[PDB]
């Protein structure tokens, strides 16, 4: 589909479970069953391993870049029940924090919108979700949601930063009390929405449409529309698009995107075009876009091996 670009020999010894570009698209973080997190500085072509970060005792499942306003920070989560925060200072990568407050595998990590501060959500196979907060002064603060999912949490995704009433006149200097939300998917077949109220996290909604384990959840970035959109995928081979047209009604409507013949592993939103990337057990990556009639169409099918 797209013209062929650089090939990166990662020198790995196993399957890369997940990969994320940094905010400016100058670096690629990758993580594997080999227990390493590898960072590549692929600027203007030129594949370049710049760090091999070792600190996990098991397979690393997900990596998340923080917003560059806090410097070059990377989170990783693993089967070893740990979340590690890596920071680059003067071109040296170091472990700056380690969180061990989960009793089972930590399957997903997601940084909050930078407007909320330096906040990390972590979903675990112990069924809990932990919110790690860095205030600039002292240790990381931890708010743990115990029994968030009955069997295990597989995925976490933050809601976009929305200022309530952004079309209402306000003073030049003021603090915008953001509604902090995130979505989680679990092994109880539920997609759950969470809200911060009075410094505590509460379950705001349960979304029931999957018939087997929710594998991934992705909150669509705000494109300046009032409609909030979430994608979820599951072991049942379904992908759902959840829409909420009014933030006051909290009414979420599921629309079936597609049903694959195999498991769907990950869902990811394009920042600018509301395009959903869907990764299946069939070793395909499909791209989906909503048409003007509200129908979802597959706009590309990317097979392993056509590069």
């Amino acid at each position: 589909m797209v013209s062929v670009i650089n090939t990166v020999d990662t020198s790995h010894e196993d399957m890369i479970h997940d990969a994320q570009m940094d905010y400016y698209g100058i670096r690629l973080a990758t993580c594997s069953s080999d227990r390493s997190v590898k960072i590549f500085d692929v600027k203007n072509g030129g594949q370049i391993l710049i760090a091999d970060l070792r600190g996990h005792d098991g397979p690393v499942w997900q990596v998340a870049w923080a917003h560059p306003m806090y410097g070059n920070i990377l989170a990783s989560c693993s089967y070893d029940r740990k979340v590690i925060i890596w920071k680059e200072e003067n071109g040296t990568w170091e472990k700056t924090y380690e969180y061990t407050g989960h009793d089972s595998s930590v399957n997903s990590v997601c940084w909050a919108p930078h407007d909320f501060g330096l906040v990390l959500a972590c979903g675990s196979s112990d069924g809990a979700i932990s919110i790690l907060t860095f205030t600039g002064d002292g240790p990381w603060e931890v708010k743990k949601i115990s029994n968030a999912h009955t069997i295990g949490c597989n995925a976490v995704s933050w809601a976009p930063s929305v200022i309530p009433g952004s079309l209402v006149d306000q003073p030049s200097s003021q603090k915008p009390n953001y509604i902090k939300r995130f979505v989680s998917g679990g092994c109880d077949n539920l997609v759950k929405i969470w809200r911060e109220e009075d410094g505590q996290w509460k379950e705001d909604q349960k979304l029931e449409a999957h018939s087997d384990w929710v594998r991934d959840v992705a909150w669509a970035p705000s494109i300046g529309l009032p409609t909030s959109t979430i994608a979820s995928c599951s072991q049942d081979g379904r992908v759902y698009i959840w829409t909420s047209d009014d933030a006051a009604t909290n009414c979420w409507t599921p629309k079936l995107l597609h049903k694959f013949n195999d498991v769907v592993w990950h869902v990811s939103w394009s920042i600018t075009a509301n395009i959903l990337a869907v990764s299946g057990g069939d070793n395909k990556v499909t791209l989906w876009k909503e048409s003007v009639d509200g129908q979802w169409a597959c706009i590309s099918d990317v097979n392993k091996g056509q590069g």
């Binding site: 449409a209 999957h210 018939s211 087997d212 049942d236 379904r238 409507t253 079936l256 509200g294």
Partner: protein, 231 residues
């Protein structure tokens, strides 16, 4: 845009009325306008309006006397039950098609098999205390209840006929209930069913059995049966 879509229907309605043509159904014109707005809640609202307005229109001089007549009140409750039964049958269908691997729908069409496949989703673990046995591994009273909740009394009668040796006199009461146009027992059969309910069924550990007897026997109207009627 919504108000303009309806104002066009009011114009088209009034134009036909003024020209002395057959009066179009304002419900159908407004339903066709609602379907064009792509709002599901408004579409579901007009489907409900259409179902509840499909009653025998009596040209009464007095709308109050017509509305308060026992025949008209019974027609509204029949249409409300039909709406809720069709809505729940569609919910059961969508829930089964969303969970095909767990539901095990099989290849035989019909409400009986749809309800069995729905029970694999709603009752994945055997509930202790269910009574009068199982048909093909599914609880008899749960099958009867969800067939009735889908409005398919013939699918429920198929369950009752398969479990006839466990259900006893209930089969005869249920056959009388189906053959009545108003889904009513005779006062004699109803009083027999109510007496049986108070003596034996009220203390049953099976919540589906209790609910099915309370529906057919129109009794224990204080019980909400929240174990089986959660919405």
């Amino acid at each position: 845009n919504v108000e303009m879509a309806y104002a066009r229907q009011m114009y088209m309605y009034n134009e036909k009325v003024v020209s002395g043509h057959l009066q179009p159904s304002l419900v159908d014109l407004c339903t066709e306008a609602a379907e064009r707005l792509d709002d599901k809640n408004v579409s579901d609202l007009w489907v409900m309006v259409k179902q509840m307005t499909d009653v025998p229109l009596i040209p009464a001089s007095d709308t109050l006397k017509s509305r308060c007549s026992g025949q008209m009140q019974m027609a509204f409750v029949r249409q409300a039950l039909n709406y809720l039964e069709q809505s729940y049958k569609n919910y059961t269908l969508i829930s089964v098609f969303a969970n095909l691997q767990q539901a095990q729908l099989g290849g035989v069409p019909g409400t009986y098999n749809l309800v069995r496949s729905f029970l694999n989703i709603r009752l994945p673990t055997p509930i202790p205390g269910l009574q009068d046995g199982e048909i093909e591994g599914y609880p008899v009273w749960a099958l009867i209840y969800y067939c009735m909740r889908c409005g398919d009394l013939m699918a429920a009668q198929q369950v009752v006929n398969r479990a006839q040796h466990q259900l006893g006199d209930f089969k005869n009461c249920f056959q009388e209930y189906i053959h009545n146009k108003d889904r009513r027992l005779s006062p004699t059969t109803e009083n027999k069913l109510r007496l049986h309910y108070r003596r034996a069924v009220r203390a049953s550990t099976d919540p589906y059995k209790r609910a099915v007897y309370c529906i057919i026997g129109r009794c224990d109207v204080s019980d909400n049966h929240s174990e089986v009627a959660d919405k």
